Amino acid sequence: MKSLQALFGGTFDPVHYGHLKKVETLANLIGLTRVTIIPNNVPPHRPQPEANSVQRKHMLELAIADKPLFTLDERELKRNAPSVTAQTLKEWRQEQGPDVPLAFIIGQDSLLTFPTWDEYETILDNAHLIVLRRPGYPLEMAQPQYQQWLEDHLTHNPEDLHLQPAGKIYLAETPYFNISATIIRERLQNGESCEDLLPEPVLTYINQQGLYR
Amino acid sequence: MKSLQALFGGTFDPVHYGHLKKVETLANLIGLTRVTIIPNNVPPHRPQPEANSVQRKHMLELAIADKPLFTLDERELKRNAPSVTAQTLKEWRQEQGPDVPLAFIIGQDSLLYETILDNAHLIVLRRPGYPLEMAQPQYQQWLEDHLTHNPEDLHLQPAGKIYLAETPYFNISATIIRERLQNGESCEDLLPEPVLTYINQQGLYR
Numbered sequence: 060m061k062s063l064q065a066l067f068g069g070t071f072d073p074v075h076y077g078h079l080k081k082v083e084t085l086a087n088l089i090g091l092t093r094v095t096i097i098p099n100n101v102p103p104h105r106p107q108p109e110a111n112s113v114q115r116k117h118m119l120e121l122a123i124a125d126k127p128l129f130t131l132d133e134r135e136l137k138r139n140a141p142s143v144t145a146q147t148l149k150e151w152r153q154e155q156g157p158d159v160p161l162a163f164i165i166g167q168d169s170l171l172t173f174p175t176w177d178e179y180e181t182i183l184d185n186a187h188l189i190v191l192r193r194p195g196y197p198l199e200m201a202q203p204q205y206q207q208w209l210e211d212h213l214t215h216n217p218e219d220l221h222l223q224p225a226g227k228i229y230l231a232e233t234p235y236f237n238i239s240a241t242i243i244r245e246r247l248q249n250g251e252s253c254e255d256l257l258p259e260p261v262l263t264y265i266n267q268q269g270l271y272r
Numbered sequence: 273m274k275s276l277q278a279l280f281g282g283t284f285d286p287v288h289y290g291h292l293k294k295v296e297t298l299a300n301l302i303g304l305t306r307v308t309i310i311p312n313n314v315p316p317h318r319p320q321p322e323a324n325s326v327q328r329k330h331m332l333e334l335a336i337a338d339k340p341l342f343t344l345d346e347r348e349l350k351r352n353a354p355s356v357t358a359q360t361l362k363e364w365r366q367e368q369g370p371d372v373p374l375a376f377i378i379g380q381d382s383l384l385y386e387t388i389l390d391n392a393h394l395i396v397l398r399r400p401g402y403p404l405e406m407a408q409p410q411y412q413q414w415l416e417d418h419l420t421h422n423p424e425d426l427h428l429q430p431a432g433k434i435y436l437a438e439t440p441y442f443n444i445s446a447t448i449i450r451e452r453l454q455n456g457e458s459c460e461d462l463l464p465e466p467v468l469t470y471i472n473q474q475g476l477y478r
Contacts, residue, residue, distance in 0.1 A: 103417075104386070104389040104390060104418070104431075104432060105386035105387075105389070105414065106386055106410055106411035106413075106414040107410065107413070107414065108410070109408075109410045171353070172356070172358075172359065175358060175359060175362050175387075199352055199353040199354075200353065201351070201353050201356070201359045201363075202363075203352060241408070244408060245408070
């Protein structure tokens, strides 16, 4: 077949070394060669992002330009409706075909919440999901009847991600980074440095556009 | 439709008249007829309570026994995982339905997540004397976008709107209570009488 393709979403307000370094360390132990970044739009019942739809795309494009691994998909940005995770994966399965391996990247704090998701079941119908292990936390699912759901689809051999179209779940050892989007936004208002939490081009764009200040 | 159902969580180590008399006052200004107290369990990355999961249920049961407005729900005490509010709420939205109104009670100091408005309203116990200051002024707009001053909107919509309710002041917290108990100064004004008897029977907070 062709190579496995991984998808990796978020708001990215702003994009930071956490998103990038975490995924490219994953790809060095799993053999991933191509990752597509799908930025979201926040549904109106939540706080809306500080950086607008355009700036977040610009900030992404800058961090990603020197990195062949990543590529950018602006579906949800050009989309009328709010971003629903199972809808984007149902589209990629349609366009890409049924025989190509697809995987969806999530953190551990979001897998312990996975059944809280709209069409949480229909996700594993289209792609794998690679869970970024948060070191120091257990795998405790809220209702221990989809603690079985985690056990029915868990695999420890990454070959399954590369040799099957969908359906498996992988937990991956990631490093720790003490950076988030709220940290950086706060470190900016407080006036403390950030040349190690943020790509240097992205931070220059932030200073030039006056965001988070 | 059905009645509005309000949920009110917390550690309750112990429960006291500040919790009770603040919400039944709310109940009189909002017109809600049912409140479900949902005691929580603290994840180990915080100092753990002094009274254990059984004793805190008991002190709760004694306090709620004679109040029809309140009913208890020990989802989180019998659950393996740490209690996460957006997890319990969507469970309530799951078990109750999409057309009944739901609301969640929180103090003002604790709200200062996004996911709440998916399934329920959020009624903020206003800290009297303090302003509406949100830290990062991008969900200060979110606070302003979904605020409402007509309690009807809470009774006619399943979720989405935010109400800030005037509550009275009491000089009573579990930290106040434990210290007045560990040194030995009285507390018959801060707790219902059956709860103080359970505390004095169980050797709690000394």
